[PDB]
Amino acid sequence: QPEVNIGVVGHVDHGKTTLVQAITGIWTSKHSEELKRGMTIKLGYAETNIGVCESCKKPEAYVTEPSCKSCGSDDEPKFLRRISFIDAPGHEVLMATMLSGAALMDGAILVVAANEPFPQPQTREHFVALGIIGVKNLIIVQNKVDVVSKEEALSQYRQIKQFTKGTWAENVPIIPVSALHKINIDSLIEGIEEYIKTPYRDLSQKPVMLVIRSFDVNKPGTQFNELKGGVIGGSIIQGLFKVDQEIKVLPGLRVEKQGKVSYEPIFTKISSIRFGDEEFKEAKPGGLVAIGTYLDPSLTKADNLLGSIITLADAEVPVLWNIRIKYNLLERVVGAKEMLKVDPIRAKETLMLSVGSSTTLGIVTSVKKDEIEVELRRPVAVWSNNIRTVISRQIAGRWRMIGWGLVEI
RNA sequence: CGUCCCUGCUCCUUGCACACACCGCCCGUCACUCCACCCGAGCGGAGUCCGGGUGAGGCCUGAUCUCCUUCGGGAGGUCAGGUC
Ligand SMILES: Nc1nc2c(ncn2[C@@H]2O[C@H](COP(=O)(O)OP(=O)(O)NP(=O)(O)O)[C@@H](O)[C@H]2O)c(=O)[nH]1
Ligand SMILES: [Mg+2]
């Protein structure tokens, strides 16, 4: 399995996906046909091996396969770890899925375009979302250096070295790439091998995991007799799951009784485990996993339990409707082309509460200095007291990050 | 032939929220104004209740130093314990 989850953030079309192509060799598909004409839309996914050419010279020593005869000589590169990416989209309004994604990440790579005016609306928006959430392991990258002057990718490296200054990003190193022709990527591999280090996760902890996809393996027309189970798609964060463990999802499906609303936990067994294209018997944090189940795929078709969280069956997790956020605000709206000042929060207003991987909306009942209580629509399964959350508003038709904080229970 | 349909008109009735007499009256939406008004994210100030803390003076218990005293007592310093 992959050891660690790395984001690829940045502005729209700056080539976040193309840089996941040049490292993994895997494309996100670019799909929905509408993504095949737009660009990446659902969260991409791709894995690879990072060895190291011990018997040669760095950074070109940093391989992708067990093959060192590429650089210096043969001595089959000692394998260091296997990894996995999560490619967020770059378009301004697909803010609500990149946040969602960011509940799973152990580190990131900021893909700035060398041929556009540096602080681009989303490049920043993402960055401060990073600084907010706690993803303190960043590596900036200057992407399209194959279509610019040799003066131009330096003068921008000024602009990056000056923005990256008053912000927390000390020596966050800026490795210029060319995701297109896969030149100077092995030096990006040396960055990610040094700076984005493999954290320790205590396995004895309560099994908890997030979900960001889930799919009907059933092709148009698999017969009933070999109807494989439904498939939940997401990343473990704390613990390790095993093949043939009893499980529950939360908040889980809601019933209908004449206009009423009522969510409830669903139970099932782990039918199968798989990482990449290879099936496993256990699963551990870092990486996005997938869990074959025995529940009706109608329940997990398009991506129905998106935002849900998986835990042990017979575990202790509150399914809140109403919640106490301790919070703070950005002084600006780093997101809009325009930097208009974030107003102070008004009661009886609509806001988009990102908690974990779930992207709920909710209404504000109380407003203190830094303690607000939010009634919701679709519940939230609050697995701990250390639930980072992110707070957006509708400024002008398109949803915008404005404050953050922690969930209190 | 006659009067059905066009049209005008007389007579009788029927209903009207119409009388500038149906080219009448008038209702809601949304658009935007007029006059007075209610809540309210919040800030400043007060009142009260509860639990405790302090608490000056007076009274009682005890003293030391007195001063005075007609030896019955008064005043008083100061200090320990209890009370209003
Ligand atoms: N010349 C040049 N072109 C590039 C480079 N990287 C990507 N491209 C091109 O730019 C286009 C957009 O790439 P893409 O990876 O979708 O950008 P993105 O930011 O990941 N899109 P999304 O917002 O969906 O994640 C592609 O058609 C690709 O061919 C580069 O380094 N040099
Ligand atoms: Mg992309």
Domain spanning A1-201 has what CATH number? Answer: 3.40.50.300
Q: What angle do CA A11, A16, A20 make, to 5 degrees?
A: 170
DSSP string covering A213-237: E------TT--GGG-PPPEEEEEEE
Domain ranges of chain A: 1-201, 202-316, 317-409
CB A377 within 8 A of CB A363: no
Does the C-beta of A301 come within 7 A of strand B? no
Q: How was this structure determined?
A: cryo-EM
How far from A263 is each of A25, A224, A282, A320, CA to CA, in Å?
41, 29, 29, 10
Residue A90, ligand 1, Cβ within 6 A: yes
- Gap from A258 CA to B26 C1', in Å? 40
Separation of alpha carbons A92 and A400, rounded Å: 9
Q: Entry resolution in angstroms?
A: 5.3
CATH superfamily of A202-316: Translation factors (2.40.30.10)
Q: Residue holding tokens 């009522």?
A: A262
Phi, psi of A400 (to 5 degrees): -130, 130
Separation of alpha carbons A169 and A161, rounded Å: 9
Nearest alpha carbon, ligand 1 atom 7: A15
- How is residue A143 written in tokens? 């992407």
What's the A77 CA to ligand 2 centre distance in angstroms? 31
State the virtual CA torsion across A17, A158, A131, A340 in degrees, nearest 10.
Answer: -100
Phi, psi of A290 (to 5 degrees): -145, 145
A53 CA to centre of own chain:
30
CB A363 within 8 A of CB A350: yes
Is omega for the bond preceding A251 within 30 degrees of 0, making it cis?
A: yes
**How many CA atoms are closer than 13 Å to the CA of A210, on its beta-carbon side?**
25
Separation of alpha carbons A104 and A86, rounded Å: 9
Handedness of CA A229, A234, A235, A237 (dihedral sign): negative
A317-409 to CATH, choices 3.40.640.10, 2.40.30.10, 3.30.200.20, 1.10.40.50: 2.40.30.10
Separation of alpha carbons A201 and A112, rounded Å: 31
CB A35 within 8 A of CB A163: no
Nearest alpha carbon, ligand 1 atom 3: A180
CB A64 within 8 A of CB A49: yes
State the virtual CA torsion across A231, A236, A242, A246 in degrees, nearest 10.
Answer: -70
Handedness of CA A175, A179, A183, A185 (dihedral sign): positive
Give the containing element (helix H, strand E) for A140: strand A138-142
CB A160 within 8 A of CB A174: yes
Does the C-beta of A344 come within 7 A of strand B? yes
Domains A202-316 and A317-409 share a fold: yes
